[PDB]
Design a protein around this ligand. Structure first.
Ligand SMILES: O=C(O)C(O)(O)C(F)(F)C(=O)O
Ligand SMILES: O=C(O)C(O)(O)C(F)(F)C(=O)O
Ligand SMILES: O=C(O)C(O)(O)C(F)(F)C(=O)O
Ligand SMILES: O=C(O)C(O)(O)C(F)(F)C(=O)O
Ligand SMILES: [Ca+2]
Ligand SMILES: [Ca+2]
Ligand SMILES: [Ca+2]
Ligand SMILES: [Ca+2]
Ligand SMILES: [Mn+2]
Ligand SMILES: [Mn+2]
Ligand SMILES: [Mn+2]
Ligand SMILES: [Mn+2]
Lengths: 297, 297, 297, 297
């Protein structure tokens, strides 16, 4: 009920319901505000989207802690009483010291949970080839550092252990890494980049009743699994990493082509500056001014 | 020809051609990369879009120098050899000291030019009502501070004097403010929020041969003027403030509604993660690694 | 007892003790770590010091919300279980919308309290002449915006109402502003820049039992009041704005003069890199690595 | 002669004089302003000091590109016409992509040069034990990425190749790494943490006429070499990493102890707020206001 309680809210959804928690992947203020406008119960901050939008760069370990925390801090708190934010935390941005710092900063920024992976520090989008992972022991050092931090901070922060090991090491290796991560205290597992739907269902069964998160990558190299299919498979969380970045690009490109070729933008006329401001908290802002005895609005 | 020479490039377009310089309004890395992909010769960074995307807030003087400079620094330099960036600089974010600091920071960040307005410091989007401006003398203090700075720094920075005075003080007041600003050293004038096309053409004639910039606000409260109409009116620059923010919102919202109702994202399948990375400089990054003797890619 | 509970801790000191809360003014990680090392029960983040250190500029409204919040966020959380931080929040960095945003951001960053003043937005260090203030009504708009925010956020945040009105409007005006601010919900009053010790004691009596905070400015233009004198006067908080910035400058300058003239630094040999790291949390960091199963340290 | 030409200035000092370029190590705005006040011809930004001051943490790979670039950008440009800044760039903050990004960002921020080391990414202050380095080939990948970037950007940026290999691999290994780095295009070599003065002189002779930089670490684990000794050894640059951080700590601590025990700060009375503002550019700021037609000052 309290402000900044996203971790508690997400934890309650996980531990106190059997619902499949659907998290659209957002990457900036506009995408996040739109997901909130539509009543999603939880949001996901994509690292790839954060890098594309905040830095104009590809998902190649270019965004680091500062950029990622800044974006997550902004998104998670647009509404102090709003939906929990699960944020990508990549590899933790360094060794255990940085992993711990990252978890600490996300927690203090009101982030509800985060996924932490076993990629080498010079990482890459999980759907790109040539993707290498660290040893099981080195991965567990990351998991332990993160878990110790959330415990030290007496936080309900939901730590998701992600493994990118499928591409290079295979299925069994992923399952063992996730089991190990579970024992070290991770709350949810994420096997990245399933190659088949049968494999997705099998991973859920292999780790049950420990909850799994399914990462849907729009137009990527994994099977198209629907929300209803995921729920039936037994997933507890499903994130849609490119749910907003992709259509934003498609629309921006087609609009700018129209502008280039025809000299007009041609955006549907209901999308006015004021509507965009309304989506982005205009009413709240005007109420602050009015409530304070201001007469600006 | 040199890297980071956006100010020189824009200046050349202005002083050495009669072309109408078309600048799509961008607000983040993805929108800017898309405009660059399509070959626009100049870009515009919207303050409203920057605030919506970087902060998730309405255009109510919430973004300040740090946010605005950070966004402009990122956008202007995605390609050190790319198109010039004209960036909103709002009111300068304070008194003359801040105006000067702002111009100094934009210049050092490779920004090609910026528009500086006469709104009170607690400003608002120029298409919102209740919009008040400072006195002519106080506005000119801002213009002088900015001009002195670009001169002190021996820069070709293009300073655009914007007046928001039409709403509250009328046309003649705008023209006089722009003439005054011209004499203090502003390079281009921007009469914000024309009420009619006839009025737009008249302002151009009133100030000729001093160049004007037309601010097209998609779905806003000013006449829809096309690129060809603007060119015929004699404008030298035309910016499209909401050209990317608006369609991005429309697309994100419709996609997320589909996700909510139907459990699938449904973005056209050609918009893959790799294509988005390509738009955002994947090839460049891989060449850096390969050229350095790395074998990551 | 909980991490990030600085507001609760400061509130308890204020409401549940009669102690004079002594807050050394810190401005960066080193100054803050040193105050913590020495066991101070509360810290103060100086805006002037933050501007000098983070920006290399004078206290002339050059630092804005981003810089100030970033510094306060860093300092308040060096130890999640450490002493409360009272942070300068200047004028709130804009109109009521910005005042509210500022208070919201400080609260979420674990800041325990902050002082909010009645200077015009283009403000200046309170010990500089030519210092103008806004009307009583405009000041109260700021106070109301801040109080509404801390209440909305269900926070124990300690809001200190500062008045800079003495210089231009006199004593009685200050007292009335502070009384008004108290009624609007400010927790503590700060009459800036007393001209005499008798005047300091008189202000405390005028507002009792509402607590006052005394701002000691080292080498400034107000009387030198000692901790014991302040306690006897009835002050409840005393901050030492320049307690670390000033001696740091003196020492840096004398060392660099020695280096320039004599080619050696000559710092006392007990001040080793490792000791500085120890002050700045080396042990904590090594324990994180060791505890995670790392063998780096 | 131009603003933001630190790289050109440093290059000229190096290539066009035989002077030993003395760079006091600065870490914030106050330390940098003080070095400038005293007329030093070049400054050095310490990574350890940046981490202690901006983040309150030890030099354990906690500061990353954003923090380091932000600090260097601030320091290098306090005076657009002032002394060149050499900035620590640690390992480059990732693989070749990040190394290149770092060099690109430093260049665009007006930084004159930077030192890039062969430590593993989870690095540590060079005077701490347990310090491991990457292979020669992996180090050269960093050097190549950095050199290619400065060339691509047509910059005079001075790239200093630092090797931390002495501790673990010995002298000959250091010399070979530096020779290799020279061939890949590094401008200056830095053999970190000499164990003896004889060894310092020998390294200079081994690499002559390729210039070396001597890193003096105040109160550290390397011999105390004076400016005159360094010049006689043939070093071309000498940086004093802890020249300001160390005495600042000593002074802050002794002042705060006095405050704690005796209730007074006791800083020499000539160190007034106004003097600190003067050091930090007060006059400049007032001239901006006055020159713009403002009457604030
Ligand atoms: O969005 C993300 O950053 C992500 O990690 O989920 C991903 F899509 F890039 C991925 O790597 O699968
Ligand atoms: O995009 C902008 O921030 C702008 O200034 O051009 C505007 F559209 F918001 C405006 O105020 O007209
Ligand atoms: O430290 C501060 O910023 C301060 O506000 O307390 C002051 F000292 F600058 C002041 O204005 O008195
Ligand atoms: O100041 C620095 O960060 C440094 O790199 O020069 C050092 F002193 F920490 C070092 O590692 O020698
Ligand atoms: Ca339209
Ligand atoms: Ca699709
Ligand atoms: Ca010494
Ligand atoms: Ca004194
Ligand atoms: Mn990711
Ligand atoms: Mn704007
Ligand atoms: Mn202050
Ligand atoms: Mn270093």
């Amino acid at each position: 009920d309290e402000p900044f309680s996203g971790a508690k809210k997400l934890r309650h959804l996980l531990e106190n319901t059997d619902e499949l928690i659907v998290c659209p992947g957002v990457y900036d203020g506009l995408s996040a505000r739109t997901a909130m406008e539509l009543g999603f119960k939880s949001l996901y901050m994509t690292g790839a989207g954060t890098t594309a939008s905040r830095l104009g760069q590809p998902d190649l370990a270019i965004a680091q802690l500062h950029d990622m925390r800044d974006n997550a801090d902004m998104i998670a708190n647009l509404d102090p009483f709003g939906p929990p934010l699960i944020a990508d935390m990549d590899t933790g941005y360094g060794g255990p010291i940085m992993v711990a710092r990252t978890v600490e900063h996300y927690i203090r920024s009101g982030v509800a949970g985060a996924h932490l992976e076993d990629q080498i520090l010079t990482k890459r989008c999980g759907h790109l080839s040539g993707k290498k992972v660290v040893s099981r022991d080195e991965y567990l050092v990351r998991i332990r550092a993160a878990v110790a931090t959330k415990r030290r901070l007496r936080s309900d922060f939901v730590l998701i252990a992600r493994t990118d090991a499928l591409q290079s090491l295979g299925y069994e290796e992923c399952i063992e890494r996730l089991r190990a991560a579970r024992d070290e205290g991770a709350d949810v597992g994420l096997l990245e980049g399933f190659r088949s739907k049968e494999q997705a269902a099998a991973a859920v069964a292999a780790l049950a009743p420990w909850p799994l998160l399914l990462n849907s990558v729009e137009n990527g190299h994994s099977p198209l699994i629907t929300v209803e299919e995921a729920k039936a498979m037994g997933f507890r969380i499903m994130i849609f990493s490119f749910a907003t970045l992709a259509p934003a690009y498609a629309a921006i490109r087609e609009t700018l082509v129209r502008l280039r070729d025809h000299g007009v933008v041609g955006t549907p006329d209901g999308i006015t500056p004021v509507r965009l401001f309304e989506v982005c908290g205009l009413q709240d802002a005007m109420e602050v001014d009015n409530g304070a005895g201001g007469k600006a609005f």
